[PDB]
Design a protein around this nucleic acid. Structure first.
Ligand SMILES: Nc1ncnc2c1ncn2[C@@H]1O[C@H](COP(=O)(O)CP(=O)(O)OP(=O)(O)O)[C@@H](O)[C@H]1O
Length: 342
RNA sequence: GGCCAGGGGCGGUUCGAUUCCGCCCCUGGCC
């Protein structure tokens, strides 16, 4: 009922970037972002008022959050990246990439209308990650990781210029100059991706990791060791679909494998790494070798003593990553399936 | 909104087991 309010109070609001992208790409979203060419707080305040919902206004920020059902909506006054009015375009030009710099009017006057100045819709059509201007990567070197994320997650490719700049930025050292926190969280974001591996491939292609993770350096075993896990993760997800896991961290572990900074747990520390992870990590050094090596002697029944390690699945997955004892574990899951169904 | 965790819940893997996970709920932390 925002189109109405905005009118009552002679304002212009629009949903923006992030969400508009997914929309075009036909993807349901519960997090919606708005940009008001006036005072967002008031808009948000009256909005909740009319819905009888609580509001969290953040003055000085010119922002306010509220929730209607499972709808998490955020209103923000137009700006220039934190004075004066500032038009939508101005707020929209300080954005990520063209596919993320589009807006849709929720103004009754011209409702539903898609607003794109930078040809984001085209880039979205031609599958392209393109920045708004030359200094883009310099202004915020986190966008590097972002660029790759989307490129990886959407199977989009970087424009000639964008790739050219992106490369400049990396060898210009900016990755080692950005607010670690931003970079860190950005990676956790990618880490959550389902096409995370394909994202990781791009990290290789531009030597990004070699700058963020200190003791890191790419080696072919690990690479195909990654794809190998891809195979497990895929099938497993199909069968033992009953119980899954944030497969993403498994990949990271393998990358972390061949540890660096004194068993670089310090990285898993920066990373808001879950329990099973910070755990399944320590178990690598102690049993990745023994478990496997000592496993080579079994008839049956000692499957039962290894079943105690599944206390946190993952490991059960990092084993198939060694051909020899692959089908062994493949039959385990099926095996126990005969014990529960005598 | 992710995770520390300090106290619940409706479902579970087992024969249980507040030790195992799904999540939700609450209490104080970090991005
Ligand atoms: N450094 C940055 N530069 C430009 N835009 C940024 C930015 N950081 C955040 N944004 C903007 O903030 C929004 C990020 O919010 P999210 O809800 O996580 C959506 P997203 O990152 O666009 O896509 P997602 O649904 O895959 O997460 C985007 O709409 C984006 O334009």
């Amino acid at each position: 009922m925002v189109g109405q309010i905005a009118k009552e109070m002679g304002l212009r609001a629009y949903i923006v970037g992030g969400v508009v992208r997914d929309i075009l790409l036909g993807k349901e979203v519960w997090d919606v972002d708005f940009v008001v060419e006036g005072n967002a707080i008031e808009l948000a305040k009256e909005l909740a008022r009319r819905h009888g919902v609580n509001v969290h206004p953040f003055p000085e920020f010119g922002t306010a959050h509220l929730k209607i059902g499972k709808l998490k909506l955020e209103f923000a006054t137009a700006r220039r990246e934190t004075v004066e009015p500032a038009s939508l375009k101005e707020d929209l030009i300080r954005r990520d990439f063209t596919i993320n710099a589009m807006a849709i009017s929720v103004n009754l006057e011209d409702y539903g209308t898609l607003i794109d100045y930078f040809g984001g819709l085209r880039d979205l059509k031609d599958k392209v990650i393109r920045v708004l201007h030359p200094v883009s990567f310099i202004e915020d070197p986190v966008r590097i990781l972002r660029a790759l994320r989307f490129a990886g997650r959407l199977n989009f490719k970087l424009s000639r210029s964008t790739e050219k700049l992106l490369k400049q930025a990396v060898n210009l050292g900016l990755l080692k100059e950005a607010p670690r926190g931003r970079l860190i969280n950005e990676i956790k974001l990618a880490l959550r991706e389902d096409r995370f591996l394909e994202i990781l491939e791009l990290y290789r292609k531009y030597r990004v990791l070699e700058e963020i993770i200190e003791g890191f350096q790419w080696n072919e075993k690990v690479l195909q060791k990654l794809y190998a896990l891809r195979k497990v993760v895929d099938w497993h997800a199909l069968e033992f679909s009953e119980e899954r896991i944030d497969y993403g961290w498994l990949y990271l572990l393998i990358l972390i494998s061949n540890l660096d900074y004194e068993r670089g747990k310090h990285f898993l520390e920066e990373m808001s790494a879950p329990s099973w992870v910070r755990e399944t990590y320590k178990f690598m050094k102690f049993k990745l070798g023994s478990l496997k090596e000592e496993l080579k002697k079994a008839k049956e029944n000692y499957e039962v003593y290894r079943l105690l390690k599944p206390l946190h699945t993952s490991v059960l997955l990092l084993l198939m990553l060694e051909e020899e004892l692959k089908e062994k574990i493949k039959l385990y899951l099926e095996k126990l399936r005969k014990v529960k169904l005598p």
